Structure formats: structure tokens, C-alpha cells
Amino acid sequence: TNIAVYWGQNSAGTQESLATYCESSDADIFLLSFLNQFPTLGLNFANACSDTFSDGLLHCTQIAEDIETCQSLGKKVLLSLGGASGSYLFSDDSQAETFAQTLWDTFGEGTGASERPFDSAVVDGFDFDIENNNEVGYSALATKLRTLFAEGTKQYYLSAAPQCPYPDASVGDLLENADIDFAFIQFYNNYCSVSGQFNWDTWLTYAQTVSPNKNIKLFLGLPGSASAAGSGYISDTSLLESTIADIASSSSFGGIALWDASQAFSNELGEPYVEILKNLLTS
Numbered sequence: 001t002n003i004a005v006y007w008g009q010n011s012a013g014t015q016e017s018l019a020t021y022c023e024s025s026d027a028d029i030f031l032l033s034f035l036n037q038f039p040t041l042g043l044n045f046a047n048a049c050s051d052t053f054s055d056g057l058l059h060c061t062q063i064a065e066d067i068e069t070c071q072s073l074g075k076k077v078l079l080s081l082g083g084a085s086g087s088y089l090f091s092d093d094s095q096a097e098t099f100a101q102t103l104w105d106t107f108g109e110g111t112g113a114s115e116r117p118f119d120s121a122v123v124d125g126f127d128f129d130i131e132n133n134n135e136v137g138y139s140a141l142a143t144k145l146r147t148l149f150a151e152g153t154k155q156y157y158l159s160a161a162p163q164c165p166y167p168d169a170s171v172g173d174l175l176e177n178a179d180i181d182f183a184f185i186q187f188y189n190n191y192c193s194v195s196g197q198f199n200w201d202t203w204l205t206y207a208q209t210v211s212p213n214k215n216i217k218l219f220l221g222l223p224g225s226a227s228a229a230g231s232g233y234i235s236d237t238s239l240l241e242s243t244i245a246d247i248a249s250s251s252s253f254g255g256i257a258l259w260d261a262s263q264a265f266s267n268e269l270g271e272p273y274v275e276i277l278k279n280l281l282t283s
């Protein structure tokens with residue numbers, strides 16, 4: 001089991017470099033937040049990158065260096081598409097399939113000469129954090145990416161970030177119709193959070209019975225601090241322990257995901273929140 005953390009949007013204000021969190025040993029998977037504009041490419045990583053190519057697209061040499069450092073240390077670094085707010089849509093499947101090629105050539109191991117925000121660094125795949133209630137294109141995009149990944153020289157990963165209500169109005173189709181490695185389910189800002197009417201059991205049925213990938217790994221997505229989300233933050237370590245005990249008893253359990261790194265690393269409970277969770281997973 002693994003800890004995934006979103007990084008890039010500086011929820012806490014005190015966000016450190018990506019490599020700083022990779023070097024902490026409290027997290028395993030890093031989701032760069034976000035490619036918030038597409039098909040016409042646009043990235044945003046708050047204070048962590050501000051230089052651009054002449055045409056306005058972010059050019060991020062420090063993030064590039066840090067992606068490589070993270071990977072050397074055994075971490076997986078995915079590019080997260082979308083995010084709450086932000087400016088994106090596919091008109092249809094054909095447009096989304098074209099966009100698979102664009103992602104491969106821009107961020108992956110594709111050889112098509114185009115501007116690369118991370119220079120020679122190569123992401124380990126993509127997270128679909130679609131939050132606009134429009135599901136067009138993503139299944140097609142995911143499926144096309146899988147075909148392109150065969151050209152690469154390492155394993156690539158695709159993940160999605162549904163909110164806990166099932167089915168998810170943005171990535172539900174993606175999750176039902178494409179092969180997905182990880183579902184980082186947001187158990188926050190919603191009725192189905194851990195202290196609400198927690199609906200892990202529904203997500204488990206989805207994993208065993210609906211997901212094209214029967215080996216999909218489901219993650220308990222949580223806010224990293226009281227200030228990381230409106231509702232859903234858990235500070236009761238007993239509840240965390242028992243929650244983990246309940247859900248870790250299947251092969252479908254992948255670990256915990258956190259919004260976001262700046263929050264989970266700085267929020268102390270006098271030990272970082274991310275450390276508390278990493279440690280509960282280990283047992």
C-alpha cells in the first residue's frame with residue numbers, strides 16, 4: 001500500500017519543491033496539479049513555476065529536475081489533468097484521441113517535436129481529476145494512451161480522482177470503460193466522507209465487478225489538514241486506524257491519497273499528518 005499526494009496548488013501556502021516531498025519518505029506517488037487547460041495546453045503550479053515559452057506555456061526546469069530526482073528515489077510522478085475550476089473540455093472522442101498523442105509527445109516518451117514543459121523529464125503517467133461534470137472523451141483518451149505507452153521504456157500509470165458519490169459525474173464513464181491503475185476517491189466535501197455515510201463498500205463493488213481492470217487499486221482520498229477542504233478532515237487517529245482496518249482487508253485497497261502535500265506535510269498532530277498515515281498503513 002502507498003500514500004499518494006497531490007502537489008502543485010499550494011493549498012497550505014507553504015508549499016516546498018516537489019523534490020523536498022519526494023525526499024521525505026512519507027509519500028510514494030506524486031500527482032502534479034495541474035494541467036488545468038486543454039486541448040490548448042495550459043499548466044499551473046502556483047509559485048513553483050513561472051517561466052514560460054514565448055507562447056505562454058509554462059516551462060518548469062526545477063520541476064523537471066525534481067521529477068527525475070523523485071524517480072531516482074523510487075517514486076511515481078503523474079501529471080494530473082483538470083482540477084476544480086480551470087478550463088478544459090473535449091468536444092468528442094476523436095478530439096480526445098488526438099490529445100493522447102499530444103500528451104505522449106509533450107510529457108511522455110513520444111518523439112514528436114513539440115514544446116516540453118519538463119524538458120527531458122518524463123512523467124510516469126496521468127491522473128484524471130476531472131471536476132466539471134462533463135465526461136466526454138476521457139475513456140477514449142485513456143484507451144489511446146495505453147496503446148502509445150507500448151512505445152515507451154517503463155511502465156506507465158493512469159488514475160482517476162472521482163469524488164465519493166457513485167457514480168462520479170465527471171470520471172464515471174472513464175472508470176467504467178477504460179483500464180485504470182488507481183482511483184483516488186475524494187472522501188471529502190461530500191456526504192459519503194468517513195464520518196458521513198462512508199461508501200467504500202460501493203467502490204469495492206465497482207472494483208470487483210465493473211472496472212475493466214479487475215486489479216484496480218482504490219485509495220482513501222483525504223484532506224491533509226483542517227484547512228485543506230470544507231469538510232471531511234479526520235484528526236481522530238482511532239477512527240483512521242479502524243477505517244484502515246476495515247478497508248485494508250481486500251486486494252483492491254491501494255492506500256491513502258491526500259489533498260495536498262503542502263497541507264499533509266505541515267499539518268502536525270507533533271508529527272506530520274502524512275507520517276501518521278504512512279505509519280498506520282505499514283501496520
Ligand SMILES: CC(=O)Nc1nnc(S(N)(=O)=O)s1
Pocket residue numbers: 006009011083084085129161186228259
Ligand atoms: C483531487 C482534488 O482534491 N482536486 C482538487 N482540485 N482543486 C482543488 S481546490 N478547490 O482545493 O483548489 S482540490
